[PDB]
Design an enzyme around this catalytic site. Sequence first.
Site, PDB file in Angstrom:
ATOM      1  N   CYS A  64     -25.897   7.693 -64.490  1.00 36.91           N
ATOM      2  CA  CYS A  64     -26.300   7.674 -65.968  1.00 36.91           C
ATOM      3  C   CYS A  64     -27.004   6.088 -66.069  1.00 36.91           C
ATOM      4  CB  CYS A  64     -25.303   7.830 -66.596  1.00 36.91           C
ATOM      5  SG  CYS A  64     -26.190   7.786 -68.235  1.00 36.91           S
ATOM      6  N   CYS A  89     -21.333   5.117 -67.123  1.00 32.33           N
ATOM      7  CA  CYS A  89     -21.432   5.927 -67.886  1.00 32.33           C
ATOM      8  C   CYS A  89     -20.612   7.454 -67.059  1.00 32.33           C
ATOM      9  CB  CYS A  89     -21.591   6.251 -69.378  1.00 32.33           C
ATOM     10  SG  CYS A  89     -20.355   7.543 -70.117  1.00 32.33           S
ATOM     11  N   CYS A 104     -30.770  11.314 -71.481  1.00 34.96           N
ATOM     12  CA  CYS A 104     -31.317  13.135 -72.226  1.00 34.96           C
ATOM     13  C   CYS A 104     -30.531  12.281 -73.649  1.00 34.96           C
ATOM     14  CB  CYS A 104     -30.450  13.746 -71.759  1.00 34.96           C
ATOM     15  SG  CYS A 104     -30.269  14.002 -69.960  1.00 34.96           S
ATOM     16  N   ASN A 150     -30.402   7.089 -73.061  1.00 33.55           N
ATOM     17  CA  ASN A 150     -30.479   6.592 -71.609  1.00 33.55           C
ATOM     18  C   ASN A 150     -31.669   7.932 -71.589  1.00 33.55           C
ATOM     19  OD1 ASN A 150     -28.045   8.778 -72.670  1.00 33.55           O
ATOM     20  ND2 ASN A 150     -28.330   9.801 -70.654  1.00 33.55           N
ATOM     21  N   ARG A 182     -23.267  51.638 -32.629  1.00 35.61           N
ATOM     22  CA  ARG A 182     -23.785  52.109 -33.580  1.00 35.61           C
ATOM     23  C   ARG A 182     -23.342  52.168 -34.945  1.00 35.61           C
ATOM     24  NH1 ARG A 182     -26.950  56.115 -31.024  1.00 35.61           N
ATOM     25  NH2 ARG A 182     -25.849  57.603 -29.885  1.00 35.61           N
ATOM     26  N   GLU A 202     -27.780  10.700 -74.996  1.00 35.83           N
ATOM     27  CA  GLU A 202     -26.684  10.496 -75.611  1.00 35.83           C
ATOM     28  C   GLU A 202     -25.450   9.732 -74.938  1.00 35.83           C
ATOM     29  OE1 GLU A 202     -27.995  11.591 -72.204  1.00 35.83           O
ATOM     30  OE2 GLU A 202     -26.243  12.132 -70.590  1.00 35.83           O
ATOM     31  N   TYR A 229     -33.170  15.096 -79.157  1.00 39.11           N
ATOM     32  CA  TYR A 229     -33.630  15.227 -77.666  1.00 39.11           C
ATOM     33  C   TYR A 229     -35.261  16.026 -77.785  1.00 39.11           C
ATOM     34  CZ  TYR A 229     -33.075  15.638 -72.634  1.00 39.11           C
ATOM     35  OH  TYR A 229     -33.679  15.899 -71.214  1.00 39.11           O
ATOM     36  N   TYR A 230     -35.588  16.874 -76.921  1.00 38.44           N
ATOM     37  CA  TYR A 230     -35.951  18.181 -76.386  1.00 38.44           C
ATOM     38  C   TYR A 230     -36.414  17.875 -77.789  1.00 38.44           C
ATOM     39  CZ  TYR A 230     -35.887  17.976 -71.202  1.00 38.44           C
ATOM     40  OH  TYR A 230     -35.138  16.977 -70.527  1.00 38.44           O
TER      41      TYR A 230
HETATM   42  N1  LIG Z   1     -20.639  48.624 -36.392  1.00 37.17           N
HETATM   43  C1  LIG Z   1     -21.321  47.917 -38.236  1.00 37.17           C
HETATM   44  N2  LIG Z   1     -22.920  48.538 -38.849  1.00 37.17           N
HETATM   45  C2  LIG Z   1     -22.824  48.253 -40.265  1.00 37.17           C
HETATM   46  N3  LIG Z   1     -22.180  47.156 -40.626  1.00 37.17           N
HETATM   47  C3  LIG Z   1     -21.234  46.745 -40.057  1.00 37.17           C
HETATM   48  C4  LIG Z   1     -20.763  46.899 -38.550  1.00 37.17           C
HETATM   49  N4  LIG Z   1     -19.533  46.012 -38.437  1.00 37.17           N
HETATM   50  C5  LIG Z   1     -20.077  44.972 -39.422  1.00 37.17           C
HETATM   51  N5  LIG Z   1     -20.539  45.652 -40.461  1.00 37.17           N
HETATM   52  C6  LIG Z   1     -21.395  44.779 -41.516  1.00 37.17           C
HETATM   53  C7  LIG Z   1     -19.920  44.034 -42.418  1.00 37.17           C
HETATM   54  C8  LIG Z   1     -20.605  42.732 -43.037  1.00 37.17           C
HETATM   55  O1  LIG Z   1     -21.079  43.721 -44.540  1.00 37.17           O
HETATM   56  C9  LIG Z   1     -21.790  42.526 -42.769  1.00 37.17           C
HETATM   57  C10 LIG Z   1     -21.447  41.313 -42.043  1.00 37.17           C
HETATM   58  O2  LIG Z   1     -20.459  41.851 -40.794  1.00 37.17           O
HETATM   59  P1  LIG Z   1     -19.991  40.248 -40.111  1.00 37.17           P
HETATM   60  O3  LIG Z   1     -18.444  40.003 -39.471  1.00 37.17           O
HETATM   61  O4  LIG Z   1     -19.800  38.971 -40.580  1.00 37.17           O
HETATM   62  O5  LIG Z   1     -20.699  40.118 -39.014  1.00 37.17           O
HETATM   63  P2  LIG Z   1     -19.981  40.557 -37.377  1.00 37.17           P
HETATM   64  O6  LIG Z   1     -18.625  41.720 -37.657  1.00 37.17           O
HETATM   65  O7  LIG Z   1     -21.577  41.090 -36.064  1.00 37.17           O
HETATM   66  O8  LIG Z   1     -19.756  39.394 -36.417  1.00 37.17           O
HETATM   67  P3  LIG Z   1     -17.575  39.245 -36.654  1.00 37.17           P
HETATM   68  O9  LIG Z   1     -17.473  39.433 -35.094  1.00 37.17           O
HETATM   69  O10 LIG Z   1     -17.415  37.862 -36.813  1.00 37.17           O
HETATM   70  O11 LIG Z   1     -16.789  40.193 -37.437  1.00 37.17           O
HETATM   71  O12 LIG Z   1     -21.824  43.610 -41.120  1.00 37.17           O
END
Ligand SMILES: Nc1ncnc2c1ncn2[C@H]1C[C@H](O)[C@@H](COP(=O)(O)OP(=O)(O)OP(=O)(O)O)O1
EC number: 1.17.4.1
Lengths: 732, 733
Positions: free
Chosen positions: B222, B459, B436, B434, B13, B438, B727-728
């Site tokens: 360089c 260098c 640039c 060289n 979720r 310098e 230079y430039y």
């Molecule tokens: N359930 C979630 N819903 C929304 N964003 C999330 C959720 N879990 C993590 N994030 C955000 C946190 C970070 O800003 C971004 C990347 O998270 P990241 O920790 O690198 O990946 P991940 O949680 O899927 O795997 P890991 O198990 O390696 O932690 O996503």
Amino acid sequence: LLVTKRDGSTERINLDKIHRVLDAAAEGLHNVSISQVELRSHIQFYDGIKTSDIHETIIKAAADLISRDAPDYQYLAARLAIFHLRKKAYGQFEPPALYDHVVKMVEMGKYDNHLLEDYTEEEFKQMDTFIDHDRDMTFSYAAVKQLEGKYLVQNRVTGEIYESAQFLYILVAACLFSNYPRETRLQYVKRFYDAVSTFKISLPTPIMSGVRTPTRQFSSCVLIECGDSLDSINATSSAIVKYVSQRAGIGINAGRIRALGSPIRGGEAFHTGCIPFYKHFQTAVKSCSQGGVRGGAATLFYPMWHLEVESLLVLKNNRGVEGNRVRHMDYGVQINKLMYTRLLKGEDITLFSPSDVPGLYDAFFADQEEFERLYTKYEKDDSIRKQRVKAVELFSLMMQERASTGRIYIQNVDHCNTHSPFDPAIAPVRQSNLCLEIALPTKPLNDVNDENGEIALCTLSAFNLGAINNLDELEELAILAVRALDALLDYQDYPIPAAKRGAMGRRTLGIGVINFAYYLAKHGKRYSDGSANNLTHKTFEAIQYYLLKASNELAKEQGACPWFNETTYAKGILPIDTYKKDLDTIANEPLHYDWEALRESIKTHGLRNSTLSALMPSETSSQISNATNGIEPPRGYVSIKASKDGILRQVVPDYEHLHDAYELLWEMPGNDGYLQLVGIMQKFIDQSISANTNYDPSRFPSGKVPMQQLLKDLLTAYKFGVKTLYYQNTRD
Amino acid sequence: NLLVTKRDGSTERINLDKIHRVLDAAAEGLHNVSISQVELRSHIQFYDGIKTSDIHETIIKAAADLISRDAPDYQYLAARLAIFHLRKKAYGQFEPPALYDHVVKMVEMGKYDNHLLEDYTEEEFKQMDTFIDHDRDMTFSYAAVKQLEGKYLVQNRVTGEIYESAQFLYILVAACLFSNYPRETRLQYVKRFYDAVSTFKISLPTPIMSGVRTPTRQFSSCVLIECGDSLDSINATSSAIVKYVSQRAGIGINAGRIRALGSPIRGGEAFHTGCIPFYKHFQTAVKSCSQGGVRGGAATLFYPMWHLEVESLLVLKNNRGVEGNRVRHMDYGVQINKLMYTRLLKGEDITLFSPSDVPGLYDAFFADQEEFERLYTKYEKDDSIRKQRVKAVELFSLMMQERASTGRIYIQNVDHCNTHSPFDPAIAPVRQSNLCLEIALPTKPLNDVNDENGEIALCTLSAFNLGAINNLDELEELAILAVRALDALLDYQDYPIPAAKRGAMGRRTLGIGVINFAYYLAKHGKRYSDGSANNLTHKTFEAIQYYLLKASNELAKEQGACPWFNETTYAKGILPIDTYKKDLDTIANEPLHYDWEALRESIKTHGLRNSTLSALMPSETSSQISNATNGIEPPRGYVSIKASKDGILRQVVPDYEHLHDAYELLWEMPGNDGYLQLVGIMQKFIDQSISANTNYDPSRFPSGKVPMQQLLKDLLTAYKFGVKTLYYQNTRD
Ligand SMILES: Nc1ncnc2c1ncn2[C@H]1C[C@H](O)[C@@H](COP(=O)(O)OP(=O)(O)OP(=O)(O)O)O1
Ligand SMILES: Nc1nc2c(ncn2[C@@H]2O[C@H](COP(=O)(O)OP(=O)(O)OP(=O)(O)O)[C@@H](O)[C@H]2O)c(=O)[nH]1
Ligand SMILES: Nc1nc2c(ncn2[C@@H]2O[C@H](COP(=O)(O)OP(=O)(O)OP(=O)(O)O)[C@@H](O)[C@H]2O)c(=O)[nH]1
Ligand SMILES: Nc1ncnc2c1ncn2[C@H]1C[C@H](O)[C@@H](COP(=O)(O)OP(=O)(O)OP(=O)(O)O)O1
Ligand SMILES: Nc1ncnc2c1ncn2[C@H]1C[C@H](O)[C@@H](COP(=O)(O)OP(=O)(O)OP(=O)(O)O)O1
Ligand SMILES: Nc1ncnc2c1ncn2[C@H]1C[C@H](O)[C@@H](COP(=O)(O)OP(=O)(O)OP(=O)(O)O)O1
Ligand SMILES: [Mg+2]
Ligand SMILES: [Mg+2]
Ligand SMILES: [Mg+2]
Ligand SMILES: [Mg+2]
């Protein structure tokens, strides 16, 4: 009513003095009018005219009368030119004593001092008797212009001529046989002089203008193979610069260079393409050329199955950007049996990078059986990076660019090793030269001064078929030609250690022929009807036999070449054993010489030279003997070429009696007749032949040459064992 | 109601609190940043089934677009967000693993050099881990992190996998460079050098940052090559170039010795075909290792003004003409001396000679200005010597004309490069520079690619960050760290060419410069064009050179002076404060604050570890890491906008919040007179040269065109204050 003499004096004009000179130049000539020349000359005369301008006036007058109806004007204006040149160099008609001439020239620094060291004053008197200065009247008008411009020793600043034609011939013979024992030295000098002065043996430009002068640069043909490394490319680049400075033709084999994207050192870096390295080669070639026009020319070689082959074929066309164009060099695509097979079956051709296919590149030249095994093995492998292209499309692209530019060449590498004087297992042929007549073994360099590398050099020459009455004269001419060129190898210098190794190791020679068109006219044969097939077989058999016979007898005298064991001749293999067997269907002429006795003579004593025969193009050396350019048929009965002194006209030899016997270039129906003759020559020729393909757009519907016709003649050439293809002449 | 996709492939979720939790951690200590504003622009882009990796890159790009003048702290917000994701890519978590555990794993993968486990024990790795402060990764700007992820950090170029973080880079570079140091002081130098580079006091070049810990040894960036007048030398030079452009190094080519077109060869046996055909061969050698002949190695070719073909070589870069007389893909530097400028002021003529027809004129052109004027007028009065007369006004006009159109035609005052030089012009003169402009080091032409008599000048570069220091006396510590590190690299790196190894081991030349100079002036409330920074500049660069020399001098006491030290002016007791242009006294009255006399007697006795030490190079890559202004050049704007692969990258000038009016932009400047004066003052202490740029705004001139009189004015203005090179020439469109 007054003329100005050379000293500055003045005297009343005398038309009898002019008429007396014209008579001397018209001796033995037919259909020539002395009065006609005077008519065109007298109207140009003015008060206070220089006597030198008077002479050049009657020369130009006679030169303009050179035509088909009166071909003997080419000898009239020539002899008039010879007369004036005598005055410029000697101050009189008859040349001074030979010994007196050399001594004066050595002091001036125009001749080498070793002439007076190897020959005594008494010996110079003997050689003077050999000289027949009346042979200068046998030159054509076009020939004399070539002599005055390229061959004769002269002051490049003031324009003063210092010698004549006969002194050139007698001193070239003197230098080449200078190291020969006195017991036979002066005998060889005379015989070789008579050969070159009577236009029986034609010598290259650097030899004619060089072999008597302090210079030692006579190398005009260079073959360099490039390895797949920065050290090799840098070495190759340095090697090119060294030889283009000596005005030599370069042959570059850069097929070993890996393709774009290929990993370097296991993936530490990635390749940037072959094209950037080809540009580096081009600038190395054009390094000693004023600007970027003319100068050093070069031909680059690469296999057809290369990964970037679609990019390399379109390097010469005028369209596109500079990023994908390398226009100032020529290219030669390397093809074998398997490629043509895919074309006939209408299958596909798989493109590989030579770094991704182990041993595939090496087998491509030495073993066609092993190649097909490795090629099919890597085709079924998915781990190897590859690209698929239809054989019909690939061959079409090649011939398309060959049609538009005319400088995209073809080399059948399988025929270059199955029918070769070299053992493919020890020293295979992987490339060619600028004009694609040279086929010699090469080895890549890791440094410019590497002593393990091998740069292929070759000394050229030519037999004049129009100067001989029968084929048995070749026995004498072969002995003279081989011994002379072999002596030059120890005479010339080598700027690169790797190049000296190849020259001293194999001692390769390349002798060709000129006036072949006139040779067929005398025997009443032609090109396109195939009526000269049996004559050609008889002719070139006598050529190859006497050449081998000459080199073999030379091997008895001074020993065979050090690397003779790497040749097929050492194993008792002759060109008559490994020729393309399809030639038997177009020629039934039997062998007229004892090849079996020669075979056992070579197996026992060996050959002084690894190679001997090679058919090169000749545009400069041919005009000297008034011959047709190499083996190519003339485009017209009279060739017109503008020059510094006006328009130069050259008439084909004996037009008076053979005007219908000749076959012009555009009078030919197709190339099938021409290619058959080439294939027959290849049966005896050690190296390659600069064969040209010709096409007339008017002879085809819609005024355009069909692709089917190009591929037809291409397959036709390969069928009869043709090794290489040079120019593709398209009529305008 | 929406769902997101985790890294393993799972689904969950959507949780806006987890996102808000991350943003809060990245916004700690930041000002004028709005978390809700970022969430507003980010949530609207969300879709069902979105990968969690795409979510993170979304809030990064959202925060990166909010980088502006009003809120400069967004450059640190998006940066820390980028750091978080990079931690996950390499380690699979936020907190990095143990240093020893990291190295062992990387050595096994073949990404690190095995000599790290040979020179350091497990206990010593544990000690160095304590030095590491991974919280310093939060001090990087957004532009900096993008440069880290792209160029510096060790990664898989195929898959794109990141294998390390920022702090592991710094601590291991210090480890490799000081690996050969004695245990009593080894780990001590490692920590101090780590603190210097991690706190952005010392900036290191790209090949060092991305190299010194990996199995590679290519750190040469360089190269200076002198070409002789022979086929053997040109072939050698060509081969030399190819080997170094393959290592992505900048090339400096001196082809002034090549005789002119028409010159006789071997007494007249042949005639020369021109310098241009050989220049083309050099270009293809340079562009030999470029995916198209563009991106790869660049090079600058040098030739004297009095050369016979100078009229043909000056017009090699313009779009006009045919390919036969054009070599556009290389830069050029015209060599000028006092006598040339003299003819310009008097409005007389300049005589053109071929270097093969005028014996000793070429050598005197660099080593002896007195001998040159004698020989020049002597050969001018000779009618047997081939020459060509051209008006000085016309010749200089042609040069500046091509410099105006292309902007890549450079100027090197060779007399100032030897009269005010750490080298003896009679033993080892400076004949080139060289890419640039310098670097000014002695060179000797090669007769072969592996010639042991030739000398190819190399260098190693570096830079002090003036915006990261609180006082000039901090340079004393930084100099010791900087000099010893670079000197150790000289024995660490490899040399593909023997002649290059001779120059590197013989003189041990270094080139340390400065960055954040514009910000340095802003902090002290100074400007460029008013000359109010003249005395400040004099005080600053004095402390730089002094502490550099002092560091190298004490190093010479410890490990011995360089082999070819006797060819330097320092060996004869000559200091930069003795040979400077005396016209500088009219624009600066700042006194010397350090004991140069005690240093003078210390150098005569013990010597210097390095022949050269100071050189002001341009820095575009290394500067963005420290969020600094590019070298000594003033910024073109308060916020730089540069498009990239991941979108538009925005970089704000350091401390814009308090110094928005203190800054002086590039096009806010009246002229170049103020800038050149500062450059001239710097040159008083700088051993080598300075990459000084000339700037012109067409709108500030009548008829919308820059007059020739102004160009020649600034040229003479630069030469007046002892400016070595130019230079430039940036022209605003
Ligand atoms: N359930 C979630 N819903 C929304 N964003 C999330 C959720 N879990 C993590 N994030 C955000 C946190 C970070 O800003 C971004 C990347 O998270 P990241 O920790 O690198 O990946 P991940 O949680 O899927 O795997 P890991 O198990 O390696 O932690 O996503
Ligand atoms: N074929 C031929 N040509 C000759 C002979 N003698 C001279 N010539 C050439 O004829 C040209 C004129 O020769 P000259 O003998 O000087 O005669 P001229 O100029 O008419 O008369 P002068 O006033 O006596 O000089 C020159 O080109 C000579 O080389 C000769 O015996 N035979
Ligand atoms: N500044 C900082 N960042 C952290 C810390 N812990 C984790 N992070 C970073 O915050 C991001 C999310 O971390 P996680 O611990 O995986 O949290 P999450 O993804 O929201 O939740 P899960 O579904 O359990 O993975 C990653 O980029 C981590 O590197 C911490 O203590 N400080
Ligand atoms: N008096 C003359 N009137 C007209 N033509 C002449 C006269 N004398 C010579 N000629 C012709 C003969 C040749 O065709 C041509 C060149 O003659 P050439 O012998 O070389 O010059 P030259 O007679 O003045 O000098 P030289 O003293 O060397 O013989 O001029
Ligand atoms: N940096 C580079 N960029 C582009 N092309 C390069 C570079 N270095 C070398 N090449 C080219 C030149 C050669 O054709 C090829 C590398 O061959 P070579 O010079 O022998 O290198 P190498 O021996 O170190 O590695 P390898 O094991 O791949 O042969 O790629
Ligand atoms: N055949 C040539 N065509 C054009 N340029 C050439 C040729 N040969 C050499 N060059 C160039 C290369 C050099 O810049 C210069 C000649 O110098 P170099 O290579 O040392 O020859 P060299 O040592 O034999 O004679 P020199 O006494 O003239 O130096 O001209
Ligand atoms: Mg006369
Ligand atoms: Mg290799
Ligand atoms: Mg997580
Ligand atoms: Mg020389």
